[PDB]
């Protein structure tokens, strides 16, 4: 199924996993490079990153 | 009592939103909360004055700076205390009797 | 003065004494064509028992500004002295034959005829003589109330405070639970109001507001010591001047007993709410408008103007509490002042350490200042070490010169 | 010099004319000369921008 914004559940899960894995190989990253790493350049890369925080997941 | 509501929920949303940031634009907060900039500024001022949000507002650049600072420097504070104590004791030895 | 004359119930039962006369005379000495018999109404047509002598003096004055009773004055003054002699005789007969009830009544109504005939010193001496009339704790409360009521007229506050404390502490801490408010009337409200009045008169605002706030609205049936509207004026203005944000929220905003008091005058309620909810321009404008009516009463005159300044200072600090870089143009606009006056006020505040900030007079921006803890600690420790070394090198020479016993002979 | 230092205790960027008026030095050029002398002596930490006749304080 699509999680509202035309994104498959697998795509969202793998995006979150890619962000979590990249959090282990980067001291700090930029929004543009983070988007180039796992698609979705800046519209929801910052949103996903901030959602992972404030929940203990990152 | 609908005025007390629509304000607690906004405060909770703001608190949960500004948690991971350190320097966040105010227009971004206004877009997220679907209110004008003046209401956002008033809500932030009220929250800071009520000690619910730990941060300050940069009015020139329209920014909100959080409090990811104030590390374990309390040691210095302790040393400060010792300092003044010693000062007093010095006088108590220089004018004890002679 | 833009919207005046909206006060009528004041002229009926505002105050009691010469102070209302002086304050109302001050109103009409300035306003065009107002110093007239209409003004003289609330001054002199309130002339009551023994109001003949000060009638003579300030009535000679009004005469000079805007006849002299000596027939009726002789008649009723010497009638009053006739009652002084004859009553005094009766009460002294009760004293001689020792009717304790009638002797205590003698004390009380003699103090009454003393405030009724000019005598004040012998009245106070009778209030102290009430000690001889040792009935019980009830008589102690009664004499404390009388002595407080008269000492309010006597322009003394140290004795008022001492009597209030001794009356609150004598019956085992207000009878512990209070004996169910004694006779379903809480005597605590009267003593608390008197203590707050005395404390504010003693240039101690915060202590006055600490005890003045907790007053029962239903137990204010004594409109001769302090009117409830005056109580609300005090408990709003002084509390705003002294109490901080948390204290204002707790003891005033969430308090329910004071709410009814705030209903007496919407102006103080609006002032408090606007100060609380980050609204300073309207609050300052309303305070400036209310300043004239507040200065009208002299029981707050040696207290109002200074307090106003204090309030303003507090506002300033609050305006800079959540800001790290404020624009002084908006600050001046919101504080009903120009940029230069705000700059001078901020410089004065910073010089005394009230607010930690720095003024940038290029874009007119007030920046926040953060103190480096480590650097300050190191600097002050080095200064302390230098001072200690200097003191030691002085003391060693002092001891050396003491060993030789050097002095000018 | 004491008055100028107390000025540095409050301001961050001040006009030369404003400094002359506050310290009663009666002249922006004289105030600039006094500030330059104090900077040379090391009693004060300041810099002078002659584009706007301004003096800034860098107390680090």
Swiss-Prot record, chain A:
Signal peptide: none annotated. It comes from the Eukaryota. It is found in: Cytoplasm; Nucleus; Cytoplasmic vesicle, Secretory vesicle, Synaptic vesicle. Component of the COP9 signalosome complex (CSN), a complex involved in various cellular and developmental processes. The CSN complex is an essential regulator of the ubiquitin (Ubl) conjugation pathway by mediating the deneddylation of the cullin subunits of SCF-type E3 ligase complexes, leading to decrease the Ubl ligase activity of SCF-type complexes such as SCF, CSA or DDB2. Also involved in the deneddylation of non-cullin subunits such as STON2. Component of the CSN complex, composed of COPS1/GPS1, COPS2, COPS3, COPS4, COPS5, COPS6, COPS7 (COPS7A or COPS7B), COPS8 and COPS9 isoform 1. In the complex, it probably interacts directly with COPS1, COPS2, COPS3, COPS5, COPS6, COPS7 (COPS7A or COPS7B) and COPS8. Interacts with TOR1A; the interaction is direct and associates TOR1A and SNAPIN with the CSN complex. Interacts with STON2; controls STON2 neddylation levels. Interacts with ERCC6. Belongs to the CSN4 family. This is COP9 signalosome complex subunit 4. It comes from Homo sapiens (Human). The lineage of its organism: Eukaryota, Metazoa, Chordata, Craniata, Vertebrata. The chain holds residues 291 to 348 of 406 of the full protein.
UniProtKB/Swiss-Prot annotation, chain B:
Phosphorylated by CK2 and PKD kinases. It comes from the Eukaryota. It is found in: Cytoplasm; Nucleus. Coiled coil: none annotated. Component of the CSN complex, composed of COPS1/GPS1, COPS2, COPS3, COPS4, COPS5, COPS6, COPS7 (COPS7A or COPS7B), COPS8 and COPS9 isoform 1. In the complex, it probably interacts directly with COPS1, COPS4, COPS5, COPS6 and COPS7 (COPS7A or COPS7B). Specifically interacts with the ligand binding domain of the thyroid receptor (TR). Does not require the presence of thyroid hormone for its interaction. Interacts with CUL1 and CUL2. Interacts with IRF8/ICSBP1 and with nuclear receptors NR2F1 and NR0B1. Interacts with NIF3L1. Belongs to the CSN2 family. Essential component of the COP9 signalosome complex (CSN), a complex involved in various cellular and developmental processes. The CSN complex is an essential regulator of the ubiquitin (Ubl) conjugation pathway by mediating the deneddylation of the cullin subunits of SCF-type E3 ligase complexes, leading to decrease the Ubl ligase activity of SCF-type complexes such as SCF, CSA or DDB2. The complex is also involved in phosphorylation of p53/TP53, c-jun/JUN, IkappaBalpha/NFKBIA, ITPK1 and IRF8/ICSBP, possibly via its association with CK2 and PKD kinases. This is COP9 signalosome complex subunit 2. It comes from Homo sapiens. The gene is COPS2.
Curated annotation (Swiss-Prot), chain C:
Pfam families: CSN1_C, PCI, RPN7. It is found in: Cytoplasm; Nucleus. SUPFAM superfamilies: Winged helix' DNA-binding domain. It comes from the Eukaryota. Its main location: cytoplasm. GO terms for biological process: JNK cascade; protein deneddylation; protein neddylation; regulation of protein neddylation. The PCI domain is necessary and sufficient for the interactions with other CSN subunits of the complex. Mediates the interaction with CAPN8. Component of the CSN complex, composed of COPS1/GPS1, COPS2, COPS3, COPS4, COPS5, COPS6, COPS7 (COPS7A or COPS7B), COPS8 and COPS9 isoform 1. In the complex, it probably interacts directly with COPS2, COPS3, COPS4 and COPS5. Interacts directly with inositol kinase ITPK1. Interacts with CAPN8. Interacts with USP48. Interacts with ASB4; this interaction negatively regulates GPS1. Belongs to the CSN1 family. PANTHER family: 26S PROTESOME SUBUNIT 6, COP9 SIGNALOSOME COMPLEX SUBUNIT 1. This is COP9 signalosome complex subunit 1. It comes from Homo sapiens (Human).
Curated annotation (Swiss-Prot), chain D:
The chain holds residues 304 to 363 of 423 of the full protein. This is COP9 signalosome complex subunit 3. It comes from the Eukaryota. Widely expressed. Expressed at high level in heart and skeletal muscle. Belongs to the CSN3 family. Component of the CSN complex, composed of COPS1/GPS1, COPS2, COPS3, COPS4, COPS5, COPS6, COPS7 (COPS7A or COPS7B), COPS8 and COPS9 isoform 1. In the complex, it probably interacts directly with COPS1, COPS4, COPS8 and COPS9 isoform 1. Interacts with CK2 and PKD. Interacts with the translation initiation factor EIF3S6 and IKBKG. Interacts with ERCC6. It is found in: Cytoplasm; Nucleus. Amplified and overexpressed in some osteosarcomas (OS), suggesting that it may participate in TP53 degradation in OS. Component of the COP9 signalosome complex (CSN), a complex involved in various cellular and developmental processes. The CSN complex is an essential regulator of the ubiquitin (Ubl) conjugation pathway by mediating the deneddylation of the cullin subunits of SCF-type E3 ligase complexes, leading to decrease the Ubl ligase activity of SCF-type complexes such as SCF, CSA or DDB2. The complex is also involved in phosphorylation of p53/TP53, c-jun/JUN, IkappaBalpha/NFKBIA, ITPK1 and IRF8/ICSBP, possibly via its association with CK2 and PKD kinases.
């Amino acid at each position: 199924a699509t999680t509202a914004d035309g994104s498959s559940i697998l795509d969202r899960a793998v995006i979150e996993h890619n962000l979590l894995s990249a959090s282990k190989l980067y001291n700090n990253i930029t929004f543009e490079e983070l988007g180039a790493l796992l698609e979705i350049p800046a519209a929801k890369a910052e949103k996903i990153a901030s959602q992972m925080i404030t929940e203990g997941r990152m | 009592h609908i005025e007390e509501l629509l304000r607690n929920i906004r405060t909770q949303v703001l608190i949960k939103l500004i948690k991971p940031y350190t320097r966040i634009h105010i227009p971004f907060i206004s877009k997220e909360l679907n209110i004008d900039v003046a209401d956002v500024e008033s809500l932030l001022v009220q929250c800071i004055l009520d000690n619910t949000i730990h941060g300050r507002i940069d009015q020139v650049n329209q920014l909100l700076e959080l409090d990811h600072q104030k590390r374990g420097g309390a040691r210095y504070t302790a040393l400060d205390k010792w300092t003044n104590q010693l000062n007093s004791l010095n006088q108590a030895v220089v004018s004890k009797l002679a | 003065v833009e919207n005046p004359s909206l006060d009528l119930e004041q002229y009926a039962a505002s105050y009691s004494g010469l102070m209302r006369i002086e304050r109302l005379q001050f109103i009409a000495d300035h306003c065009p064509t107002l110093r007239v018999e209409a003004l003289k109404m609330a001054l002199s047509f309130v002339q009551r028992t023994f109001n003949v002598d000060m009638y003579e003096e300030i009535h000679r004055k009004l005469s000079e500004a805007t006849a002299l009773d000596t027939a009726w004055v002789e008649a009723t003054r010497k009638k009053a002295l006739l009652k002084l002699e004859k009553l005094d005789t009766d009460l002294k007969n009760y004293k001689g034959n020792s009717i304790k009830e009638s002797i205590r009544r003698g004390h009380d109504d003699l103090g009454d005829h003393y405030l009724d005939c000019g005598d004040l010193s012998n009245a106070l001496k009778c209030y102290s003589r009430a000690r001889d009339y040792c009935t019980s704790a009830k008589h102690v409360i009664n004499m404390c109330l009388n002595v407080i009521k008269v000492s309010v007229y006597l322009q003394n506050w140290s004795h008022v405070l001492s009597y209030v404390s001794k009356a609150e502490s004598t019956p085992e801490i207000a009878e512990q639970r209070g004996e169910r408010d004694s006779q379903t009337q809480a005597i605590l409200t009267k003593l608390k109001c008197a203590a707050g009045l005395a404390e504010l008169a003693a240039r101690k605002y915060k202590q006055a507001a600490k005890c003045l706030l907790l007053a029962s609205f239903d137990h204010c049936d004594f409109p001769e010591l302090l009117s409830p509207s005056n109580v609300a004026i005090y408990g709003g203005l002084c509390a705003l001047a002294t109490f901080d944000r948390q204290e204002l929220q707790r003891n005033v905003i969430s308090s329910s007993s004071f709410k009814l008091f705030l209903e007496l005058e919407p102006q103080v309620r609006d002032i408090i709410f606007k100060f609380y909810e980050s609204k300073y321009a309207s609050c300052l404008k309303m305070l400036d408008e209310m300043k004239d009516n507040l200065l009208l009463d002299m029981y707050l005159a040696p207290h109002v103007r200074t307090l106003y300044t204090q309030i303003r200072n507090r506002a300033l600090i609050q305006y800079f509490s959540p800001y790290v870089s404020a624009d002084m143009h908006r600050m001046a606009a919101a504080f009903n002042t120009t940029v230069a006056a705000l700059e001078d006020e901020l410089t004065q505040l910073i010089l005394e350490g009230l607010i930690s900030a720095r003024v940038d007079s290029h874009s007119k921006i007030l920046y926040a200042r953060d103190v480096d803890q480590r650097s300050t600690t190191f600097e002050k420790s080095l200064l302390m070490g230098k001072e200690f070394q200097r003191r030691a090198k002085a003391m060693m020479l002092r001891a050396a010169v003491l060993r030789n016993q050097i002095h000018v002979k | 010099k004491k008055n100028i230092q107390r000025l540095t205790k409050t301001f961050l960027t001040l006009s030369l004319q404003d400094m002359a008026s506050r310290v009663q030095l009666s002249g922006p050029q004289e105030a600039e000369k006094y500030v330059l002398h104090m900077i040379e002596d090391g009693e004060i930490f300041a810099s002078i921008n002659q584009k706007d006749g301004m003096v800034s304080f860098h107390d680090n």
